[PDB]
Design a protein around this ligand. Structure first.
Ligand SMILES: *[C@@H]1O[C@H](CO)[C@@H](O)[C@H](O)[C@H]1NC(C)=O
Ligand SMILES: *[C@@H]1O[C@H](CO)[C@@H](O)[C@H](O)[C@H]1NC(C)=O
Lengths: 52, 52
């Protein structure tokens, strides 16, 4: 539901982010794809964590 | 010296004003079930349409 999220974020009027420390035991965090290239190296979304 | 009032013109004006008032005051329509107008959560585009 793209329109609802767009409207909600537009009405909020901010992109302030506070980092929390989730536990996430026993897995590999971060994870990079060849589609997202930050600088010259592969990357991913900055605010989302790909667990593998 | 003396003073007096005219009853015919007074009654004509009073009658016209009373007719206007009777046409305005007391006539009301009945509406039973309608949409919700107050919301406690945010859910997206349907609530926005209702508010609009
Ligand atoms: C994270 O999980 C480990 C598993 O050994 C546990 O000992 C630890 O208390 C957990 N940390 C939090 C903040 O819940
Ligand atoms: C994921 O990368 C972030 C940013 O470099 C880092 O803070 C975090 O410790 C990494 N998680 C790992 C290596 O499990």
């Amino acid at each position: 539901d793209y329109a609802s999220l767009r409207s909600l974020v537009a009405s909020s009027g901010t992109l302030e982010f506070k980092n929390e420390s989730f536990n996430w035991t026993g897995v590999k965090q971060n994870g990079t794809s060849s589609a997202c290239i930050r600088g010259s190296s592969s990357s991913f979304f900055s605010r989302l964590n790909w667990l593998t | 010296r003396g003073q007096a009032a005219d009853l015919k013109s007074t009654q004509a004006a009073i009658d016209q004003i009373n007719g206007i008032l009777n046409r305005l005051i007391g006539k009301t329509n009945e509406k039973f079930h309608q949409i919700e107008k107050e919301f406690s959560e945010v859910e997206g585009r349907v609530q926005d349409l209702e508010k609009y």
